[PDB]
Design a protein around this nucleic acid. Structure first.
Lengths: 127, 64, 63, 206
RNA sequence: AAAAAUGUGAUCUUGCUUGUAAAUACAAUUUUGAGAGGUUAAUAAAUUACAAGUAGUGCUAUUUUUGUAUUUAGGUUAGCUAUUUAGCUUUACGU
């Protein structure tokens, strides 16, 4: 006896997203970016913005009757890092703190099979 | 010093339990110089019964 | 306001830059065999009954 | 009950008072105890001072600060504000006052309400300066209870001091105006308006 | 507002659509140092208050015995923080 919205988190760097949808996700619901819960504008990726941010995800999920939740983590990804930033950790523990249930966890970080030539230039990024 | 400062004093300072001179400038407000006087006066069976020492503190109190 | 009074067993190793922190096990006096490993701030010994309203954060070793 | 009849009448008032009995024969330290578990062990109730002074070899041994009579780690603090600095006999001619202005105002066992301004006045959930960087967090950690009471006396002395300070009130009437309202603590005092203000800077950082 | 009691197509008093008569005082430090050309654009709050359209209810409603009066009064926001049952500022919004 429960329903399941899908998470749809992500934290590079300098920002992070708690972003609920349906389990299909052609529709969406309460999306929360970092800067939003911090106007320093400095630390937009903070172990905290995420923290008070996730709690928006169970305010506007424990609003439109999302009991419970399955949960996705994405890096940048791409070319980039594939080393999850702060975010995703603090979220993954604040989301458990907000009554929410949890189910099926897994990365999605977009991996390439090579090719797109990475930025910087040969001799590199450098201070 | 006029005559609703001593009879506000004596009808208020028999069963009035904790007293001093910081007690008559915060409750009866003006004076202190005078006050250690219309307290101590007498000491008629109906003013203050003390556990007061020297000069430097005069910590007085209840006849009963 | 729930207070859980936890007894210190094993004083462990010194920490912090300035030595302001010991580490600390603790045996929960009032649920013995639980034996969590928090931190504290003091000049400690074994047997300093220790006071926590935060049951539990279990803590990790701070420069 | 037997007056010694020695020329030198060395009292029959301070002979029936302290023969029948031990302890400072104004306050009886005699069915007065401590009500918390933590600050037993680290706050002497009393080895007998029959006055409120021991040489005092309390800091060599890293602990005995403990063994130290509460009343005489108090007179101990006051010891300041710098100008007095040194004066213990002004600081016992002041706390030998304090214990009469608690007994007189409440009607208590005042040497107990002296002890209940200890455990209540202690900051438990306290911070520390993690170093940490240019800015970091005061990892929030509950002092031993050792330290606690170091603060529980330390606090109380920095707010009943400004109260004589351009003040009609002679620390004897602000100290007992702090401990009665600091045990009921209240917040008309200064500990339970910093103690709480350190809990309350920690509960976040944490 | 405590008492009666004359009544007014039998009697009293809970707001809803309008549009206007008016209070936030200012002075003094401080703004470039005397002396005003632009408290520029912005602007008003809903407050006492009264009448249309009356879900109310027939809309205004008196004489005369009380106590100096007896009636009831006193308290209310906004911002930081990992001290989140707590710490920190305190009616800001270019000053």
């Amino acid at each position: 006896s429960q329903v399941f919205g899908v998470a749809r988190i992500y934290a590079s760097f300098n920002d992070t997203f708690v972003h609920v949808t349906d389990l299909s996700g052609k529709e969406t619901i309460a999306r929360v970016t970092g800067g939003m819960k911090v106007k320093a504008d400095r630390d937009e990726s903070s172990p905290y913005a995420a923290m008070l941010a996730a709690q928006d995800v169970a305010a506007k999920c424990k609003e439109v009757g999302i009991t419970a939740v399955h949960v996705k983590i994405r890096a940048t990804g791409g070319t980039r890092t594939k080393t999850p930033g702060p975010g995703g950790q603090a979220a993954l523990r604040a989301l458990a703190r907000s009554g929410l249930r949890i189910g099926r966890i897994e990365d999605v970080t977009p991996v390439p099979s090579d090719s797109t030539r990475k930025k910087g230039g040969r001799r590199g990024r450098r201070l | 010093l006029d005559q609703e400062k001593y009879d506000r004093i004596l009808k208020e300072v028999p069963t009035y339990r904790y007293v001093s001179v910081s007690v008559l400038v915060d409750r009866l407000k003006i004076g202190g110089s005078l006050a250690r006087i219309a307290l101590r006066h007498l000491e008629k069976e109906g003013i203050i019964k003390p556990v007061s020492k020297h000069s430097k503190q005069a910590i007085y109190t209840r006849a009963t | 306001t729930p207070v859980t009074l936890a007894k210190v067993i094993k004083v462990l190793g010194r920490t912090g830059s300035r030595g302001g922190v010991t580490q600390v096990r603790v045996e929960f006096l009032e649920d013995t065999s639980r034996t969590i490993v928090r931190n504290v701030k003091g000049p400690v010994r074994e047997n300093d009954i220790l006071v926590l309203m935060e049951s539990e954060r279990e803590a990790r070793r701070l420069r | 009950f037997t007056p010694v009849v020695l020329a030198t009448p060395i009292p029959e008032e301070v002979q029936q008072a302290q023969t029948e009995i031990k302890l400072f024969n104004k306050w009886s330290f005699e069915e007065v105890e401590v009500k918390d578990a933590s600050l037993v062990d680290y706050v002497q109730v009393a080895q007998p001072i029959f006055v409120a002074h021991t040489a005092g070899r309390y800091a060599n041994k890293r602990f005995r600060k403990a063994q130290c009579p509460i009343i005489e780690r108090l007179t101990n603090s006051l010891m300041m504000n710098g100008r007095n600095n040194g004066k213990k006999l002004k600081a016992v001619r002041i706390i030998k006052h304090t214990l009469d202005i608690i007994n007189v105002l409440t009607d208590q066992n005042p040497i107990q309400v002296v002890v209940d301004a200890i455990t209540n006045t202690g900051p438990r959930e306290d911070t520390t300066r993690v170093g940490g960087g240019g800015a970091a967090r005061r990892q929030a950690v509950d002092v031993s209870p050792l330290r606690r009471v170091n603060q529980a006396i330390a606090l109380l002395t920095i707010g009943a001091r400004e109260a004589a300070f351009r003040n009609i009130k002679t620390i004897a009437e602000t100290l007992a105006e702090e401990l009665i309202n600091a045990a009921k603590g209240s917040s008309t005092s200064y500990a339970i308006k910093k103690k709480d203000e350190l809990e309350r800077v920690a509960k976040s950082n944490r």
